[PDB]
Design an enzyme around this catalytic site. Sequence first.
Site, PDB file in Angstrom:
ATOM      1  N   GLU A   5       7.432  -8.828   4.840  1.00 47.94           N
ATOM      2  CA  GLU A   5       8.441  -8.382   5.781  1.00 47.94           C
ATOM      3  C   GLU A   5       8.649  -9.353   6.907  1.00 47.94           C
ATOM      4  O   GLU A   5       7.690  -9.709   7.583  1.00 47.94           O
ATOM      5  CB  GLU A   5       7.904  -7.095   6.410  1.00 47.94           C
ATOM      6  CG  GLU A   5       7.368  -6.103   5.387  1.00 47.94           C
ATOM      7  CD  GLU A   5       7.862  -4.714   5.697  1.00 47.94           C
ATOM      8  OE1 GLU A   5       8.784  -4.633   6.535  1.00 47.94           O
ATOM      9  OE2 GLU A   5       7.268  -3.714   5.238  1.00 47.94           O
TER      10      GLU A   5
HETATM   11  C1  LIG Z   1       0.752   1.929   0.986  1.00 46.98           C
HETATM   12  C2  LIG Z   1       0.844   0.714   1.888  1.00 46.98           C
HETATM   13  C3  LIG Z   1       2.093   0.145   2.179  1.00 46.98           C
HETATM   14  C4  LIG Z   1       2.153  -0.998   2.995  1.00 46.98           C
HETATM   15  N1  LIG Z   1       3.311  -1.676   3.088  1.00 46.98           N
HETATM   16  C5  LIG Z   1       3.190  -3.001   3.283  1.00 46.98           C
HETATM   17  C6  LIG Z   1       4.276  -3.887   2.955  1.00 46.98           C
HETATM   18  O1  LIG Z   1       5.144  -3.610   2.111  1.00 46.98           O
HETATM   19  N2  LIG Z   1       4.276  -5.085   3.675  1.00 46.98           N
HETATM   20  C7  LIG Z   1       3.281  -5.441   4.577  1.00 46.98           C
HETATM   21  O2  LIG Z   1       3.377  -6.523   5.155  1.00 46.98           O
HETATM   22  N3  LIG Z   1       2.285  -4.614   4.862  1.00 46.98           N
HETATM   23  C8  LIG Z   1       2.240  -3.436   4.238  1.00 46.98           C
HETATM   24  N4  LIG Z   1       1.134  -2.679   4.382  1.00 46.98           N
HETATM   25  C9  LIG Z   1       0.145  -3.088   5.403  1.00 46.98           C
HETATM   26  C10 LIG Z   1      -0.802  -4.146   4.809  1.00 46.98           C
HETATM   27  O3  LIG Z   1      -1.152  -3.902   3.441  1.00 46.98           O
HETATM   28  C11 LIG Z   1      -2.119  -4.150   5.590  1.00 46.98           C
HETATM   29  O4  LIG Z   1      -1.838  -4.331   6.979  1.00 46.98           O
HETATM   30  C12 LIG Z   1      -3.147  -5.203   5.179  1.00 46.98           C
HETATM   31  O5  LIG Z   1      -3.295  -5.426   3.772  1.00 46.98           O
HETATM   32  C13 LIG Z   1      -4.454  -4.798   5.857  1.00 46.98           C
HETATM   33  O6  LIG Z   1      -5.449  -5.707   5.439  1.00 46.98           O
HETATM   34  P1  LIG Z   1      -6.763  -5.697   6.358  1.00 46.98           P
HETATM   35  O7  LIG Z   1      -7.751  -6.705   5.847  1.00 46.98           O
HETATM   36  O8  LIG Z   1      -6.507  -5.442   7.808  1.00 46.98           O
HETATM   37  O9  LIG Z   1      -7.367  -4.315   5.802  1.00 46.98           O
HETATM   38  P2  LIG Z   1      -7.710  -3.875   4.292  1.00 46.98           P
HETATM   39  O10 LIG Z   1      -6.716  -4.398   3.315  1.00 46.98           O
HETATM   40  O11 LIG Z   1      -8.097  -2.442   4.415  1.00 46.98           O
HETATM   41  O12 LIG Z   1      -9.117  -4.601   4.092  1.00 46.98           O
HETATM   42  C14 LIG Z   1     -10.260  -3.942   4.604  1.00 46.98           C
HETATM   43  C15 LIG Z   1     -11.267  -4.066   3.483  1.00 46.98           C
HETATM   44  O13 LIG Z   1     -12.534  -3.508   3.912  1.00 46.98           O
HETATM   45  C16 LIG Z   1     -13.107  -2.826   2.794  1.00 46.98           C
HETATM   46  N5  LIG Z   1     -14.015  -1.818   3.327  1.00 46.98           N
HETATM   47  C17 LIG Z   1     -13.696  -0.641   3.972  1.00 46.98           C
HETATM   48  N6  LIG Z   1     -14.759   0.028   4.390  1.00 46.98           N
HETATM   49  C18 LIG Z   1     -15.829  -0.777   4.026  1.00 46.98           C
HETATM   50  C19 LIG Z   1     -17.217  -0.648   4.203  1.00 46.98           C
HETATM   51  N7  LIG Z   1     -17.795   0.411   4.782  1.00 46.98           N
HETATM   52  N8  LIG Z   1     -18.011  -1.608   3.682  1.00 46.98           N
HETATM   53  C20 LIG Z   1     -17.423  -2.656   3.097  1.00 46.98           C
HETATM   54  N9  LIG Z   1     -16.142  -2.930   2.903  1.00 46.98           N
HETATM   55  C21 LIG Z   1     -15.392  -1.914   3.362  1.00 46.98           C
HETATM   56  C22 LIG Z   1     -11.911  -2.231   2.049  1.00 46.98           C
HETATM   57  O14 LIG Z   1     -12.234  -1.838   0.725  1.00 46.98           O
HETATM   58  C23 LIG Z   1     -10.871  -3.349   2.183  1.00 46.98           C
HETATM   59  O15 LIG Z   1     -10.996  -4.195   1.022  1.00 46.98           O
HETATM   60  C24 LIG Z   1       0.986  -1.618   3.545  1.00 46.98           C
HETATM   61  C25 LIG Z   1      -0.251  -1.026   3.283  1.00 46.98           C
HETATM   62  C26 LIG Z   1      -0.327   0.087   2.433  1.00 46.98           C
HETATM   63  C27 LIG Z   1      -1.727   0.600   2.187  1.00 46.98           C
END
Ligand SMILES: Cc1cc2nc3c(=O)[nH]c(=O)nc-3n(C[C@H](O)[C@H](O)[C@H](O)COP(=O)(O)OP(=O)(O)OC[C@H]3O[C@@H](n4cnc5c(N)ncnc54)[C@H](O)[C@@H]3O)c2cc1C
Lengths: 459, 462
Positions: free
Chosen positions: A58
Amino acid sequence: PRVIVVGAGMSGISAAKRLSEAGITDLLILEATDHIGGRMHKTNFAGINVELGANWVEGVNGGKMNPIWPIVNSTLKLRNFRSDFDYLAQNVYKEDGGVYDEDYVQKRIELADSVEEMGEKLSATLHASGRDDMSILAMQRLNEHQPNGPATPVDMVVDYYKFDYEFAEPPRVTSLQNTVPLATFSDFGDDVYFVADQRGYEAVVYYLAGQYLKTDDKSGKIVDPRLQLNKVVREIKYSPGGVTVKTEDNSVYSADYVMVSASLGVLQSDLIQFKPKLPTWKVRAIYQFDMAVYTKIFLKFPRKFWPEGKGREFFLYASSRRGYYGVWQEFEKQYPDANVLLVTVTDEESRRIEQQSDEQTKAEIMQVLRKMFPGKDVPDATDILVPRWWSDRFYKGTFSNWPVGVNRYEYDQLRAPVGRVYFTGEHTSEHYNGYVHGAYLSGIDSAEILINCAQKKMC
Amino acid sequence: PRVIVVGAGMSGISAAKRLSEAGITDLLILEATDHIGGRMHKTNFAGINVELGANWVEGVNGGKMNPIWPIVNSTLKLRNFRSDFDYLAQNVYKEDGGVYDEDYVQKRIELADSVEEMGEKLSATLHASGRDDMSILAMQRLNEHQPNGPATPVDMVVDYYKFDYEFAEPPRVTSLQNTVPLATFSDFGDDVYFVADQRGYEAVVYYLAGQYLKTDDKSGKIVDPRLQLNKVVREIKYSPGGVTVKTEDNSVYSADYVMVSASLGVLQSDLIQFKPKLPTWKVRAIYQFDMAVYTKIFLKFPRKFWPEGKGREFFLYASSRRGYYGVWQEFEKQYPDANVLLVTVTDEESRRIEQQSDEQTKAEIMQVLRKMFPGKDVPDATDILVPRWWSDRFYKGTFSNWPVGVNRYEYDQLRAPVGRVYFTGEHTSEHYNGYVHGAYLSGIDSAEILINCAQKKMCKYH
Ligand SMILES: Cc1cc2nc3c(=O)[nH]c(=O)nc-3n(C[C@H](O)[C@H](O)[C@H](O)COP(=O)(O)OP(=O)(O)OC[C@H]3O[C@@H](n4cnc5c(N)ncnc54)[C@H](O)[C@@H]3O)c2cc1C
Ligand SMILES: Cc1cc2nc3c(=O)[nH]c(=O)nc-3n(C[C@H](O)[C@H](O)[C@H](O)COP(=O)(O)OP(=O)(O)OC[C@H]3O[C@@H](n4cnc5c(N)ncnc54)[C@H](O)[C@@H]3O)c2cc1C
Ligand SMILES: *[C@@H]1O[C@H](CO)[C@@H](O[C@@H]2O[C@H](CO)[C@@H](O)[C@H](O)[C@H]2NC(C)=O)[C@H](O)[C@H]1NC(C)=O
Ligand SMILES: *[C@@H]1O[C@H](CO)[C@@H](O[C@@H]2O[C@H](CO)[C@@H](O)[C@H](O)[C@H]2NC(C)=O)[C@H](O)[C@H]1NC(C)=O
């Protein structure tokens, strides 16, 4: 220094990568699931891989390059298409049969857009302290001079498509100041491109990770022992000297720092016990921000019965019940011939739905589709896929959303480390919370913060 | 000084009364409707007068006397009954039939209550500017340590009962600091008494009005020319010299001051044009506060099919759809043998419901009732009353709710006078916004501010 990164989602991998690049390679990435990518995660539905999580890059084509775009569009060339929402006015279904008059709808959309625009002007004038922030709803009342925002079914679905479909919570809980206008678009461009590639949007994460983690020369699979999957962190013990991290399988690890990348939802859940307990300022910041839920319900049918063609991709259902199965998408381009439809819901509907069976949800959806396509013989969906992110203890939601009431200083407290406990993740993105690019940049900033503190003692 | 008071609901009558009391008797109370009392207003439903609006004297038996209580319970002796909510745990219906186990429910209640109490402690510590406020929801997440507040059918209806039922908007939109704890209860007591008197709760307003306006010796009808009903104020022109008020029937009046008591919802709707336009700071304060909607859906049945007896007055429907026809009340004491039930909805449901036919609403409610009492032969309501306050231009809602986002200073701006234009109404109640006693007290307070300006030449406000 040794650093444990909790979670192998975009931000974790991104952070580890950045650390590695600063030369901190003594890393240990502990991921709860059996795979990396977190919220970027595909699945087979109806013989095709669809995205359970993020699906669009996006903010494209603007004044600044969205860091993810080149990886998607060029480096990996993941198959993708720009979403065109220009024809929405032609695709708003009446609660009980057929679409509304396009001109009527186009004006409603225009009013809505116009109001938001006035909201943008207003937003620009608010004080950084957030002392004059207001919910978007408040801004709408103010601009429309009404005691309520959009309240007819058409107005509400337009409202929902314009806000809830982006933020996953209603305008009334949403911080105006911090979402209107949105940096993501303001910086990177208004276009959004839907990734429809069998490799999955997650390929982006895998690519990043392969840039520094070891992968099998044939397999291509990551085999670096610095990445441990199925490691559910349940306890993070910290002291001025270092940290210890315990996983559900009972493994115990030690490092000089821990970079926590689990979602805000996970942090609001107690899945991970901090010892000592995070300080109150930290806890409050955590609990005050919102972890929204956006549920992508996929449905496969025995045959198409909805329109396909120009402007047909996206269509709204104007239910008198705000947010009820309101935003639909058909993939004539993305998955030609699949007979798949995607309806998205969020927030309250998401939690209600995750809590009931797929069959029950399918049945509710069939009733809506039938009401929508009264002239058609609507076959019952042959298959349905209801992602349960809020129920998933490793996510507890889909993405943060900034609520009225939280100002920047407090949002920033989210990013603030506690001693040797660092945080990263989309909810720590300075200006892109809620996005893949936000997770991505957040891993980088968080890592840089740990690097300066750890390597230059500049904390 | 001549003072025009717009609106003859509780605050306007209360304000005019206080003015009269300070010797300002050159008053003109312009009431939009054909009657006084505003949000306190009864109506005949199926042969009984039920209240469309306020129904309770809230905050009784506490350290301080709710000013409304004595008038209701003593001066007027309006028939009334203490609501007892102690048995809710035995009265929570499952979406799909029968009630939940009491012990299970009581525990959920106890949790909900404990979170709330923890919220009251936090609230006490929040900066008085309101700058650190958060929604009740945020407080709940914090105390429950969940990324969400109540989310199962039971916890949700309990939550709704605890909050939406009082505030008419969800915890997530509601200011913690300003509602938990709630001054009405802290100051006046936790009890609430439901007024169920043919004369209606509005009798309180007719009573006060009667303390200073002329009434016919036999009818007791107020006949004082200072009260003009059916006078919808459509424009208020104000200047350093005075004010001019114009009604929709073209009447034009002049005064030294005008006191506006119209609801926040009316203010947010532009029914009254101010000339010159109100200042932006005022406008913003107006739009930022919330005008909630609380819809009392009365239903009349050919026969009774729900329980009556101890703890039966109130019952909840644990819908998996939050706020869906969730809070029920049966009137074994208030309207004995009438076979009436009252289901209350608010906010989104209110808006949805005001916008569709009563028949449609009745049918929704019939399905809910049959699910709740599958063992009975639930007869279709033969009568239903859906109050449409949000749709009524003279109200545009039921009562204000302090939302997260409005700070102390902003709320004060909501009350602040603009030139010779004063404001009053429950939404201007410093600590009792949303209530009859808040309207009552707000009338006196705004009157006093006006009196100081007018009589003591103390015209600077805050
Ligand atoms: C349904 C949905 C629609 C979305 N739409 C989009 C889109 O179209 N475009 C866009 O830009 N963004 C979108 N997003 C937002 C985007 O996907 C996220 O902001 C981004 O992927 C977040 O990544 P992150 O590393 O912050 O968190 P995450 O991807 O959550 O990574 C955190 C990781 O920590 C791991 N974890 C959790 N708890 C523990 C624990 N206790 N011990 C070990 N590991 C653990 C999880 O399994 C995960 O792999 C969407 C997300 C979703 C879920
Ligand atoms: C459904 C409902 C349930 C409630 N529950 C209770 C309860 O149980 N207990 C409790 O304490 N409180 C409750 N409240 C709140 C309470 O009734 C109100 O707080 C209080 O009555 C408001 O009095 P007011 O004078 O501030 O406003 P109002 O009663 O609205 O008085 C304003 C008056 O101005 C009139 N007016 C409006 N526009 C104009 C115009 N342009 N020109 C002239 N006149 C105009 C209106 O007709 C009205 O008469 C409830 C209210 C409602 C509607
Ligand atoms: C996304 O990538 C495609 C892949 O090339 C872009 O389309 C090419 O753009 C170059 C640039 O001038 C042209 O010379 C090629 O002929 C184009 N190829 C195709 C297949 O069209 C496209 O513009 C990119 N989109 C964005 C938004 O960056
Ligand atoms: C409401 O009013 C009634 C009316 O008096 C109160 O009941 C009276 O209270 C005095 C106080 O002890 C008694 O001596 C009288 O016998 C009571 N009258 C009746 C009919 O019982 C009552 O206590 C009041 N309730 C509240 C909450 O104020």
